[model samples]
Target chain A: EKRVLSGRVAVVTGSRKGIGLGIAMRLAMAGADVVLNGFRQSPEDSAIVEKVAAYGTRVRCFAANMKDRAQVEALIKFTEKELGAVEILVNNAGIQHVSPVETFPSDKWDEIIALNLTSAFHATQLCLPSMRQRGWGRIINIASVQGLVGSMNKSAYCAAKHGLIGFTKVVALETATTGITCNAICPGYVYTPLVEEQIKAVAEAKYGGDMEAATQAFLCEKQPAKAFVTVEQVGDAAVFLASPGADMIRGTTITVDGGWVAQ
Target chain B: KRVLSGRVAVVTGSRKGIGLGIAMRLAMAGADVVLNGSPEDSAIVEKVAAYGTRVRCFAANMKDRAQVEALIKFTEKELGAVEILVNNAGIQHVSPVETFPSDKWDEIIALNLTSAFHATQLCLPSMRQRGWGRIINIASVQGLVGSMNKSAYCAAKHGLIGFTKVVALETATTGITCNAICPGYVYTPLVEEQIAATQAFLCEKQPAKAFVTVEQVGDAAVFLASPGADMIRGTTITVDGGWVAQ
Candidate 1:
């Protein structure tokens, strides 16, 4: 396959697992040198680096919390110094907690907002200078279906995700004439290890033990298509937004939520 | 039973016109309604109360944040916890972009967009605590499609709709569902006056025509707020008579 991103350098946050890892792999498959970041160092993280290396490219992992503005600056500077100037930025690292508003702890909300929403702001601010200098850049924000809809017990998570979409549009507007494009991708419900834990928790609370049946029941009741979104499907969406086909698309959010918000 | 039976709603600008129409519909749907109108419309309060909804009138200009805060507080204190909120208060002044009056532009945005934000911010916390809420912002098709001479209105309504999306996303994982109903050319008293005003101004340019009715807007609202629409959040239901289809 002729690589779409051949000779490019892509930066993905939280690439150790889940949607972040999936997106990093897709970018690599498209022929980009991938710079991955996670909160912790592990063998799995190294495995991803080695796996991307096998694709005839370079890969590196930086274990740092991108939520901190200083650390985010360092991450960008390091990516430019080591892998070449970053060309594609995938803001995918996010955390979720479920709690009602009145009883919800304010500190937790602040944490989630800082990591999920403010971190995107910091990353965009830091990376846009280099991207604009090159006059070519792609910033993809991995928002959620909840960012376009509501769910019980996830007030802060939803708020932060929604804010990210707003931030995406504002940035897109600011750079409308430039080659740097910023857009948000919203997926309904993806099957990842994180979701597996949520499934087990819900099942243990409701059905006492059987996770398989609880999983089916949860899908049948909540999701529109009665299924979890596949990681590859989300990765393909990210690829499309980063591809040449999405050149003119600006300040728009493409919801891959299977009619969850259609009604 | 009405779709909103045993429910209570707070609708802004309800002493007359579009606000009254929504109030009547909610009452028909069995909600005890709270009627809101600017103090200048104090005379219309009694007339609005006759719609058979339990009506409490608050006369305040919602363009003022203080008044908007007072209105929500009144709804919470007087009529019980407000289960439904309809952000319908708005004003429009038309002019070309270069010549648009700065104050008029600011006024429209304040009343149409920021007022809705104020109301939602105050009410949403309580709603989320109760585990149930329904918020409907009465945006216009103008929010979706641009039009000349209505730039200020369009910007305000568009911003309001964007705010609706943010609120919907914030409350998505909850029982509270926030959506915007975009009505295209609805024939309310305010709209009729707008049409007449436009006819006088653009007599040779284009003649005004009849438009959609208020009842159609009411029906769309009922659909959105019904139990059937539990999953519908951050969505815009455009009642445009196919205007946007082309």
Candidate 2:
């Protein structure tokens, strides 16, 4: 067992699937008691619970609407009661609503900001007091390339992500000497269900329904490495940020966007 | 005009180009700016002083350790103490790795990488004692990535970045923070000399079209020195016009 995070309790929001799930699994493998959170419960979710539990670290599932402050508060209390005080918090829960800013719906904008950006603020404020008392903590926010730069038709997502990065910097500065570090992992397009959906749509709309051509076009258009950043790669990066080796790394965005931001 | 009032800043290679731009910006930000180069230019010194902050010129070949040390000493004696240090003095040599000149490589490394190391070590004690300082290294995009025919420059810039990380880690508990600003292809006399070659190499891509202005680079340096960037440590703020992002 690697056991770098042994005795640590990690609370990962939106771990039912995708990038969040991969991070939860890696934290569990590192010997941390994992609290997996999402808004729904299903057999597949329970299967995720079983798989993470197989790592020999205690695991539990908590379903709560991340945008709801009371629910989020309850989720944190539940994690502390079941696992322990949160030593690692990965705020990965997010939603995307893409459209031109002029025509973007107000409610969609509000909801996305609430879930993606404000939820992080709530979670960090609630969890930081304990982390400060303990004198050791890692808060990793999963931002995107959109955070550093803008994209057409992604006004809401980009605003929330950019705001999240700015928020990350303030928190990092506020807690610089407290042994609690805050940073953001800005990944390029990853191969998630959301991305798969985009790929399929591009295939149908632009590539005569050929998925491979759409995929190739997509890589050629943006990501310079011509590759999709893997969930496991991001998971490993999170583990690195949470490790002691990165103790001096505060208030920065680690770009795992396949050199997307490097160009 | 800003919070940098009464502070002293030492900017290397400010006789011309990107270094001069940064020096002017720091002066405008209200710091007493010290400009260093091979030989000081009277017109450039006056231009910097026009920003309404006191400015002085020092002549020192960056490759000489004794001269660099003397430059620091003169800056402290003249201005007060070095509160902001911008390690912007650098040189570039281009050739294939197999046929690269070892002497040129040595010169580039000494000036670009080792010179910054010396200045940082010299300025750190005072900065740490003062409990607030900014060390901005004007690294290149090649520091974060790589380019062809610039083997020595790439190696030195990358090494500078590694050095920045170590210094930042050492000073994390203090109010002092170290960072690098990696700018891609700023339009300067140095770049103007190589524009045709770069334009030819880039072909249809026309990288010259994406060249950054020296003022933009200066603005980025000012941003890094600002209080808003207090927590930004041990990282490179890339000002490449999305050049690295593609």
- Tell me, by TM-score, which candidate is best: 2
Kindly report which residue stretches of model 1 are placed more than 4 angstroms away from their true locations once superposed. Answer: B1-246
Question: Which residue segments of model 2 deviate by more than 4 Å?
Answer: A98-105, A132-136, A148-155, A173-179, A220-224, A243-254, B1-101, B107-151, B154-246
lDDT of 1: 0.81
List per-prediction Cα lDDT, in the order shown. Answer: 0.81, 0.86
Task: Give the TM-score of candidate 2 (chain A).
Answer: 0.96
* lDDT: worst 10-residue window of model 2 chain B: B200-209
TM-score (C-alpha) between model 1 and the true structure: 0.56
> For this target, which candidate reaches the highest lDDT against the unseen true structure?
2
How well is each residue in A1-263 modelled by candidate 2, as lDDT tens digits?
56888888999998888889888888888788899998977768778999789889999999998888899899999998998899999999658876788999999999889888999999999999999999999999999998997766888988899999999999999999889999999988898887888889889998999999999988876687898998888888899999889999999998888766654
Candidate 1 per-residue C-alpha lDDT over A1-263 given as tens digits, one digit per residue, 9 for 90 to 100: 48888888999987778888888888888788899898767777667788667778778888878777888898898998899999999998668777788899888998899988998899889999999999999999999877875666889988888898999999999999999899999987789998888888888988887898888877764466888888778777888888888888998897876555542
